[PDB]
Amino acid sequence: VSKANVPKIDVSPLFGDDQAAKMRVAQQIDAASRDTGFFYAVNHGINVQRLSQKTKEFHMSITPEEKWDLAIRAYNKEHQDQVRAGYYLSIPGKKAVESFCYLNPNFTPDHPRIQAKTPTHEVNVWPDETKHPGFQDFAEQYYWDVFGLSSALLKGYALALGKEENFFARHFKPDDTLASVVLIRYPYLDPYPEAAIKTAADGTKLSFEWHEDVSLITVLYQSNVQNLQVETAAGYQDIEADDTGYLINCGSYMAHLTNNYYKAPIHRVKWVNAERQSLPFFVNLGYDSVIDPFDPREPNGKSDREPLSYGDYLQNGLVSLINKNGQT
Amino acid sequence: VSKANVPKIDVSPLFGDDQAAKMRVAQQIDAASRDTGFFYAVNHGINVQRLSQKTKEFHMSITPEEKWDLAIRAYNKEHQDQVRAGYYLSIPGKKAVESFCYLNPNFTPDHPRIQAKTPTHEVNVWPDETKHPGFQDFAEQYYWDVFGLSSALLKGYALALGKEENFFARHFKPDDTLASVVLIRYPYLDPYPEAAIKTAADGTKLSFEWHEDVSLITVLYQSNVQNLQVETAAGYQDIEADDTGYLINCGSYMAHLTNNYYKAPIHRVKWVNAERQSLPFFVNLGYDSVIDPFDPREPNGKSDREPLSYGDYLQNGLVSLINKNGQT
Ligand SMILES: [Mn+2]
Ligand SMILES: [Mn+2]
Ligand SMILES: [Mn+2]
Ligand SMILES: [Mn+2]
C-alpha cells in the first residue's frame, strides 16, 4: 500500500493582498484537486495545540448524564428539535465512536431562520458551565477561526477555477452559513467491539466505509494518527498524518458545480484502536445559496447541469446518511 | 478471477396465487440479495428473442441525422425539453457507447404531471414511423411487459422482507411510474477510442466504472455478452451470461429503505470490443411515493433513516450522474 500524494501548501498568501502570491497558491490547490483531491493547508495561523487540548478535555470529562442530556433525537427521543446539533453517543457493542456537533453560533431563537423553522437550521446545545467552564466560549471562537481559514481557502478555489476571487466566498456569510463543526472521538477499547469494525472487500478493517463528503469543502484537523485512505487510480492509498496542518478536500457540491472537474474524493477511515480525535469543519453555504454550474473543460465554460440551491442539496445529502453516525 | 454465485430463480410462482410457492421464491430472492445481490429471474414469460432482434434492428438502421434529431439536450442544445428521454450520442474519440432512453408510455401532454411540468416527467420522442415501422409500438408494449415482470418481482421482494405482498407494488402504477428502459449499444470499433476505455485500479479495461444503481431494483436483459463484475468480499467476480433470463439487482433506494439489509451491489462493466447491446429496465416508483424505512435487523424494525419520497430520491440521484452518459 503506498502513500497518497498529498502536498503541503502554504496557505498564508490567501490571507494577504498579493494577487501574484495568491495565484501561485491557487495553482497548487488546482493541481492537488485534480490529483488526489486532498492537500494540507500549512501556515493557517490557528492555535491547533489548544484546540486538541480543549477537545480531549471535553471528551474525557463529560459525564454520561450530560451526554444523555445533550444527545440528539436519534439517541434521546425527548429531543425532537435536535437533529444535527448535540451529542452522538456510543452504543455498547454496536458503536464505539462518539462525537459532538455544533452549528453556526448566530443561530439563536431570534434568528429569522430559526423563527421560520427552516430545515437544517438548529440552535446549539451546550454543556453546563460548572462542569465545563469556558468550553462554549472556546468552541464558538474556534468556529469563527476555521470560518476565517475556510473563507481564505475559498478564495483560493475560485482563483484555481479561474473565477473571480469572491465567486465562492460571497456565499459564505456568518449570519447564515450552514457549516458545522464535529468533535469526533475514537476511543481505545479492549476488547474493541467487533460490530464496530467493518471490513472492506480488500479485507481492510475500517471505522467508516467509503463515501464522498456532503459539503462544499471540508476543513479537518486530526491528531497524529494514520487512518485515512483515498481511492486513487492506483486503488486506495494512505494519507500521511500531520498534526500541524489542516487536511482539505472537496465535497460533492464542488463536484456538482465544476461538473466533476474537481471531483469529491471517495475515502474511508481505517480502524485503529487508539485514543485519537478528528475535527472536521464542513464548509456549507447559505440555505438559499445558488451558484450556476460550469465546466472549465468547455470553451463556453458552460455546463449542462442545472443550479441546485444549497438548502436542497444539504437536506437531501444529510437524509441519505445514518443519522446515528452523522458527519456534517 | 472467479464467477459470482448468481442463482437462477424460477419466478413463475410470483404471477400465481399459490402463497406457498410464492413464499418459497421469496426465500430464494432473500438469500440472493444477501449474497452477491444478483440473481437470474428465469421463467418470466417474456419473448426475449423478439426483443433482441427488434433492438438490434433499431441500432443498425437508425441514421446519424435521426440520432441528432432525437438527441437529448446535453447533446442537441435545441431540444430544451429533453433531459432524460431521447438519444445519447457517441462522441468521436471520447465516447463509444450510444443509447436511447424512453419513459412511461402514458406520459402525454394531457397527463397532469406533464402539464404541471414536474421534474423527471417527460414525453417520449421516437424515430419516424416510415423509417422504423412498428418500433414505437414494440417499445411501448415491451415497457408494459417488463412492467408486469417487475410488478411481480416486487411482490417477491415484499415477502422476502416479511412485509405484505403489496408493500412495494402498491406504489408501482401504470399512470405515474417513473421507470425507464434504456437501449444501450456497445459498438465494435477498430481502432477503439482509447479515451472510451477506463482502466480499473486492478488493471481491468472497463466501459463503466464501479457504481450502485439509482433505482428501486434493476431488471436487465443482456444477450451474448459477459461484461458485468460484482465486488464481493473476495473482490470482483464475473457474472455468467444467460440469454434466457433477466438479471435482477437492487438500486440504492432499496438499500435506504431496508437500512442496508439489502445492499445495492457495487458493480462495473468490462470493456468488450464487439457489437452487443444491453437493455436495463430501471424500476422507479411514482413521484410522490414515500415508503417508511425499516431495519429487518431490529425487533421494532425501527430505523434511523428518514422517509425519502421517490421523486426527491430520483431527482437528486440523476443529477449526481453525468447527463451525457446516463443509465436510468
Ligand atoms: Mn432533556
Ligand atoms: Mn468524509
Ligand atoms: Mn430538432
Ligand atoms: Mn448499473
From Swiss-Prot, chains A, B:
GO CC terms in record: cytosol
Cofactor field: Fe(2+)
Catalytic reactions of this protein: N-[(5S)-5-amino-5-carboxypentanoyl]-L-cysteinyl-D-valine + O2 = isopenicillin N + 2 H2O
Gene Ontology biological process terms in this record: penicillin biosynthetic process
Positions annotated to bind Fe(2+): 211, 213, 267
Chain positions of site Transition state stabilizer: 208
Consequence the record notes for mutating residue 269 to T: Strongly reduced the catalytic activity
Annotated localization: Cytoplasm, Cytosol
Domain Fe2OG dioxygenase, residue spans: 173-285
Effect of residue 280 to L: Abolishes the catalytic activity
Sequence positions that bind isopenicillin N: 84, 88, 180, 186, 278
Lineage top rank: taxon: Eukaryota
Effect of residue 228 to I/V: Strongly reduced the catalytic activity
Pathway(s) served: Antibiotic biosynthesis; penicillin G biosynthesis; penicillin G from L-alpha-aminoadipate and L-cysteine and L-valine: step 2/3
UniProt keyword Transmembrane helix, yes or no: no
Residues that coordinate or bind N-[(5S)-5-amino-5-carboxypentanoyl]-L-cysteinyl-D-valine: 84, 88, 180, 186, 211, 213, 278
Keywords: Antibiotic biosynthesis, Cytoplasm, Iron, Metal-binding, Oxidoreductase, Vitamin C
The protein's role, per its UniProt record: Isopenicillin N synthase; part of the gene cluster that mediates the biosynthesis of penicillin, the world's most important antibiotic. IpnA catalyzes the cyclization of the tripeptide N-[(5S)-5-amino-5-carboxypentanoyl]-L-cysteinyl-D-valine (LLD-ACV or ACV) to form isopenicillin N (IPN) that contains the beta-lactam nucleus. The penicillin biosynthesis occurs via 3 enzymatic steps, the first corresponding to the production of the tripeptide N-[(5S)-5-amino-5-carboxypentanoyl]-L-cysteinyl-D-valine (LLD-ACV or ACV) by the NRPS acvA.
The family this protein is said to belong to: Belongs to the iron/ascorbate-dependent oxidoreductase family.
PANTHER family the UniProt entry points to: 2-OXOGLUTARATE (2OG) AND FE(II)-DEPENDENT OXYGENASE SUPERFAMILY PROTEIN, OXIDOREDUCTASE, 2OG-FE II OXYGENASE FAMILY PROTEIN
Subunit architecture: Monomer.
Name of the protein this chain belongs to: Isopenicillin N synthase
Organism: Emericella nidulans (strain FGSC A4 / ATCC 38163 / CBS 112.46 / NRRL 194 / M139)
Protein encoded by which gene: ipnA
